[PDB]
Design an enzyme around this catalytic site. Structure first.
Site, mmCIF file in Angstrom:
data_model
loop_
_atom_site.group_PDB
_atom_site.id
_atom_site.type_symbol
_atom_site.label_atom_id
_atom_site.label_comp_id
_atom_site.label_asym_id
_atom_site.label_seq_id
_atom_site.Cartn_x
_atom_site.Cartn_y
_atom_site.Cartn_z
ATOM 1 N N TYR A 1 0.855 -1.210 0.000
ATOM 2 C CA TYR A 1 0.000 0.000 0.000
ATOM 3 C C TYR A 1 0.885 1.253 0.000
ATOM 4 C CZ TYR A 1 -4.220 -2.666 1.617
ATOM 5 O OH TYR A 1 -5.334 -3.441 1.730
ATOM 6 N N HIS B 1 11.892 -5.290 2.649
ATOM 7 C CA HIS B 1 11.057 -4.189 3.093
ATOM 8 C C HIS B 1 10.668 -4.284 4.560
ATOM 9 C CE1 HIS B 1 7.416 -1.709 1.478
ATOM 10 N NE2 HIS B 1 8.055 -1.031 2.465
#
Ligand SMILES: [Mg+2]
Length: 323
Positions: free
Chosen positions: A63, A128
């Site tokens: 997102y 990440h």
């Protein structure tokens, strides 16, 4: 007569050979304070960035704002940029459905990202937000897997990202020299928090390039202030509101001051900004060129630094306990 055209000066990224614009085009967190835009606005923002000399684009499969892997891919295709004239970073391991840093997921991730980006390789593939897993998994499993992905040619350079600065020492002390090429840090190089500086020699000594992000600390260093979700301590929120008000009352703009401040350390190769529209691109590039040609307002900076001193380097928790 004519007007002189100043441009951004590129920086060298670690030992990678890549020469990157000091302002980079980054992602925005969900629920960021600008709000989302239509896809046409996001595409125009990327075009404006390419036209103003930004050559470093950071994205992920997670997102964000309206600017996504597919939007970047379409804009790069439409602009026809030579591949060696821009730098793309994407990430793996963090998805809308949760985190998965396992060998089979990340190997698949890269291929999906490349298709969306319309590339044969990314310059950089990051792990990440690694503080959300056991960092020993990153050491023992995920960085080994990314070596295989690098050897395949689908990523030229490997990175790690996340919030706590302690992730970088934990991982980089425990992988073979040369295993990681770059890091992305956020929220730790801006007027309220410069703790990234404490890692710059360390990273250099390991031949790791340095990318920073969130120079406005995800909306703290803005007139509007942070989103309601922002996890900063209230004491930090209060001080940043006072700093913004200090600038505003004098007819000055904290966002410009903050952007310029984050650009004042050449050991950070690029500072990523989440930009949503052509105007935000224009403003940030102008701040960077103005820094280079006119200087920061040092007296205003000193005043803002005094306001923020009691909360300097104050942060917030992120991820799981490392146990
Ligand atoms: Mg552990």
């Amino acid at each position: 007569a004519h007007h002189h055209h100043h441009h951004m000066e590129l920086r060298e990224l670690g030992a990678t050979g890549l020469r990157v614009s000091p302002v980079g085009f980054g992602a925005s967190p969900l629920g960021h304070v600008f709000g989302d835009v239509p896809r046409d606005v996001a595409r125009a923002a990327v075009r404006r960035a390419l036209d103003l000399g930004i050559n470093f684009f950071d994205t992920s499969p997670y997102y964000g704002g309206t600017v996504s892997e597919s939007v970047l891919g379409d804009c790069l295709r439409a602009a026809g940029v030579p591949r060696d004239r821009f730098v793309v970073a994407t990430k793996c391991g963090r998805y809308r459905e949760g985190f998965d840093f396992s060998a089979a997921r990340v190997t698949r991730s890269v291929d999906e990202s490349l298709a969306r980006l319309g590339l044969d390789y990314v310059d950089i593939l990051h792990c990440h937000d690694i503080e959300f897993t056991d960092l020993d998994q990153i050491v023992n499993e995920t960085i080994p897997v990314l070596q295989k992905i690098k050897e395949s040619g689908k990523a030229r350079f490997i990175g790690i990202t996340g919030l706590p600065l302690s992730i970088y020492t934990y991982v980089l002390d425990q992988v073979p020299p040369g295993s990681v090429d770059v890091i992305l840090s956020y929220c730790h190089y801006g007027i309220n928090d410069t703790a990234l500086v404490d890692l710059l020699p360390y990273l250099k000594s390991k031949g790791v390039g340095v990318i920073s992000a969130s120079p406005l600390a995800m909306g703290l260093l803005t007139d509007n202030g942070p989103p309601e979700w922002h996890p900063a301590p209230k004491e930090l929120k209060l001080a940043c509101r006072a700093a913004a008000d200090h600038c505003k009352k004098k007819g000055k703009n904290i966002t410009k001051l903050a952007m310029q401040y984050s650009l004042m350390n050449n050991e950070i190769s690029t500072v990523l900004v989440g930009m949503n529209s052509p105007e935000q691109v224009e403003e940030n590039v102008a701040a960077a060129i103005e820094l280079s040609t006119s200087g920061i307002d040092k007296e205003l900076l000193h005043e803002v630094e005094a306001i923020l001193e009691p909360v300097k380097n104050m942060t917030w928790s992120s991820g799981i306990e490392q146990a």
